[PDB]
Write a protein that binds this DNA or RNA. Structure first.
Lengths: 120, 56, 122
RNA sequence: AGGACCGAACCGACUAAUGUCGAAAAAUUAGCGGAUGACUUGUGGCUGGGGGUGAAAGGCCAAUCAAACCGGGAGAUAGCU
RNA sequence: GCUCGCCGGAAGACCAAGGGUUCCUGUCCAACGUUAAUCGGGGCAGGGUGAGUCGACCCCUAAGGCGAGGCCGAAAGGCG
RNA sequence: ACACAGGUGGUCAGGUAGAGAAUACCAAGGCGCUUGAGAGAACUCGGGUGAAGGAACUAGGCAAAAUGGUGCCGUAACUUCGGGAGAAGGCACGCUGAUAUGUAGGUGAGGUCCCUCGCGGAUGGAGCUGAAAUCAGUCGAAGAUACCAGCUGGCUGCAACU
RNA sequence: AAUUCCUUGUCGGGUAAGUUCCGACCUGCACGAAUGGCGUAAUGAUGGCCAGGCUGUCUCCACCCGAGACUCAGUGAAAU
RNA sequence: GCUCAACGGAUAAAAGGUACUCCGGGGAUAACAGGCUGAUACCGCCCAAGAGUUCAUAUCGACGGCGGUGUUUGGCACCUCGAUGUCGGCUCAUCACAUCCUGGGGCUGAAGUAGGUCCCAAGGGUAUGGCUGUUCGCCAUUUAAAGUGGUACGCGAGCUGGGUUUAGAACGUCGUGAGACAGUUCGGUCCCUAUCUGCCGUGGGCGCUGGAGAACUGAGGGGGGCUGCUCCUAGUACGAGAGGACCGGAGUGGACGCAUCACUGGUGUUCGGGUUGUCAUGCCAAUGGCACUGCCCGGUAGCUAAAUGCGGAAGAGAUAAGUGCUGAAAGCAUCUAAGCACGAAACUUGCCCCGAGAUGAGUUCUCCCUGACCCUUUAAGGGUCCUGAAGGAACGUUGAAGACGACGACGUUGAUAGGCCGGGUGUGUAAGCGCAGCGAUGCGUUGAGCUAACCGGUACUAAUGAACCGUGAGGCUUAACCU
């Protein structure tokens, strides 16, 4: 009855649920903005935010930890070098959620998740 | 587990009472571009609250 | 918690080794026996010279419980096993004299004060 | 050496659940029996309806078996509906 | 295209059998696919299978079939 | 009857662990099974865990649970003297060092010896084949750590047995 | 007794309690010697009983992870 | 003349079996259940020998009769054979009272106690196991008691299939045989997505008559109603001794029900750690993927029980059996005809929940609305433009709320959700580095590192204004109050 319960299943078993966020987070970091379904977007907010908070500091331990999850040398180098200093001042809240339209083919409510900055 | 006598077309219609869709009636015109976007939804071009939000 | 068909380790010099409960007394359809209750038992394993023999019916008081009891502060006392002390089926007095292992404080009744004196600990 | 033992392929089909307008006109899942032999299997032949074959139930003979299927006598007959 | 998951004495790669153009390209989306389809074993048009050594055919026979004469049987036909 | 969880002969079939064409993870190679998105009710189906008790459930231990491996030790009634029997029931298993050029047993010669002139016979038996057991220490609650992998004993009817 | 109606025969063992089970008695309703009789090691996805181990079978369910169920979008049956 | 004796003679010749079965029809005719009846059974009443020590009526009560109920075994063949589909158990029940327990009383051959019997009384309660397939019944052990029955011998479009009825097989018996049975023995397909009524929950529409936002009233309805034991009184009343109260008070329990996680625990595939196998990260190291969460050891929040608290009630009103009082008919007497007072878990309330769709649609408090006009059958009317309020809904962040609706909080004048910061909790000394050791490994830095839902803050991010719906003074008649 999920009283005071967190998380979302997203109609998947745990392992697949976890592994797709490992992929979705790195997909975000490399592109800084992605289009996805709204409930998936809200659950992504509890994943990338820890990483940007992990990149607000810097060490060898954090470099291994942010490599422990997310399993990518490219992303971890994209992290800890640009995204960290770019978000050095913000106290949390590094993502924006913009609700786009409706995915015609499953009628899913899609949305845009991007970084706050995205300065070009 | 089946019917006993076929339901009348009248009784058929009464079952279709609560099936009409509800109209939107919430099309907020954008402040700058002026598109007919839904509330809390970006426009067709990617404007929201008077800002090129999508950068696309 | 002791119930029907529960094997109990004997805890006196009455002359048994293993006993099995059959019927928790005290009230219609009572399903459980705590540390200070009378149960009806049978004898399933006895020493060859004891006061009882294999296949009799009599009563006991379950003195040790793996579930244990709860003290009024919330503390519990959980033993390792389930132990009983045999009775006299009419007079409720214990058969054997020497009682092994510790017993709980809550057995302190006037009718079990004999057992309290014979126990070594607590 | 073994109509030997344990056990995959292969073969078979004892228990239980699911299914029962099913995924399927007897299957799936979980465990089971045989597994160098009276074993199993590919290819091609021979035996036919009151007969064939049968480690024998009366089982199988093209999803059909107290007697196949197709056509004919035949619009059988029907004190019954 | 970049990550992720599954099979791996196989959900892999090849032949016989049986099917019969389903193979490849251009092109189209009504109908077919249990949904959408600019996609496809779908509609339309063009193209593709090259052998002295592979297989078949060919030579030789097995089970078994047919069977000149022959023998038997109302006829049919049966056995050889 | 279908783009159907079924059936279909023969060849090929590697790496690590492993006895193995088992199984687990992968290679070559091929695929994510042709409706999805959310929700995270009752109830059903496939499973994981459980305090205390432990067949008391039920037609019945049906189903689950559990046992499960290797080496060594040990093994009854009965018996057609083959069995029963892997009866039952126990003990050690990881990793790292030496004990000991990895000991014991082992093929066997360049070589010395040898005649009817031998990709050779006798000998040391090198080189080398070389476990395991033992001692010492160390880690974890758990060392056959996963998958995989007998539940066992007693009495009796029937049928010999496959 | 795979056979025994009367009947759950009677006695003994097992059980706190045993119409089933094992042993025995003998009045065998209506066993019997190749329509084979009585035993029998081994063997058996065989019928019945008991014990240890082990457990959610049960006392009494409780929670959690997935597939449906429920809502939205597309397609869209059936017995009656 | 022989045979038709089934004697109007199917020709003067013709016996059985079947659950492999099949076909045509029947409720014209059986088995299950219903219906009618009530012999039989079950229960009650009347008579009363007599037993009962005396005493028929304390109790039975022979012999006999008069009825009741529709639960036994039967009678009839009315419904069903173009299907009402099963014995028992399981889950889940409801009603009757001829009452098993608890409660209130009468009488005794009731001293007391503890029982016996009869009357009133349906509210709640009303075993666990062994053998049998069993219902039943026997047995074991409890309990205040382990009540009798109706409900298609309740319940199988809810489960099970043991029994019983399929095709396999065997024993005994009967039959020449096929097969059969006052018989028993192993094995053996239990189909259905709910239209309607019904029931448990939850919303939409309109109405409630001016609209809207809340708080209640209360018709009526439902839930709940069990009791053991110990002590005080008291070892008193009573008693020959042995024994041994009533009544009233209090504590402590079993079953059940409601509620909640503070504690004790369960689970916790989103949290931490260990570890086997193997693949990848170019290697070692450190991690990550998969093998049921790979196998497991712990474990927050929730949910939850075996855990922790709470309840039954008292009392009031009117009553049953029964006890009376004062009292005539009937000078007496008499519980009663007048009247009057007590008298049960029963009855109506009291206690908790639902509740104005209670169309008889209630009450109170509060807020908002006081437009110009054309028109016609001058109608509680419509139409045109102007205004559109209180408030509401939608959308959005969401929730210890929830299937979907609905409901609750917030929507920047903002702490609703995420993130972040600090704390807490949980897991047990991260990684890297340095020293010692041949090494595995161990020690220091380090009670570290990492922490899911929890707690206190913080607008960093996302909840954008406004729009849309909702109106413009509330019909008629009568009466009482003021021009």
């Amino acid at each position: 009855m999920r009283h005071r319960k967190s998380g979302r299943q997203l109609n998947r078993n745990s392992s697949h649920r976890q592994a797709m966020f490992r992929n979705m987070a790195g997909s975000l970091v490399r592109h800084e903005i992605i289009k996805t379904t709204l409930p998936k977007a809200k659950e992504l907010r509890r994943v990338v935010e820890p990483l940007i908070t992990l990149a607000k500091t810097d060490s060898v331990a954090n470099r291994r930890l942010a490599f422990a999850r997310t399993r990518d040398n490219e992303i971890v180098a994209k992290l800890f070098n640009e995204l960290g200093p770019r978000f050095a001042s913000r106290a949390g809240g590094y993502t924006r959620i913009l609700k786009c339209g409706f995915r015609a083919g499953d009628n899913a409510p899609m949305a845009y998740i991007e970084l706050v900055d995205r300065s070009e | 587990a089946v019917q006993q006598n076929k339901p009348t077309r009248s009784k058929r219609g009464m079952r279709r009472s609560h099936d009409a869709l509800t109209a939107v009636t919430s099309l907020s015109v954008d402040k700058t571009s002026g598109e007919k976007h839904l509330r809390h939804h970006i426009t067709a071009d990617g404007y929201y609250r008077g800002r090129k939000v999508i950068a696309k | 918690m002791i119930q029907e068909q529960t094997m109990l380790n004997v805890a006196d010099n009455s002359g048994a080794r293993r006993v099995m409960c059959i019927k928790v007394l005290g009230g219609s359809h009572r399903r459980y026996a705590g540390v200070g209750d009378i149960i009806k038992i049978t004898i399933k394993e006895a020493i060859p010279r004891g006061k009882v023999k294999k296949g009799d019916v009599l009563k006991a008081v379950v003195v040790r419980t793996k579930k244990g009891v709860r003290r009024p502060d919330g503390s519990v006392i959980r033993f390792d096993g389930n132990a009983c002390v045999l009775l006299n089926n009419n007079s409720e007095q214990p058969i054997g004299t020497r009682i092994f292992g510790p017993v709980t404080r809550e057995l302190r009744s006037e009718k079990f004060m004999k057992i309290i004196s014979l126990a070594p600990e607590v």
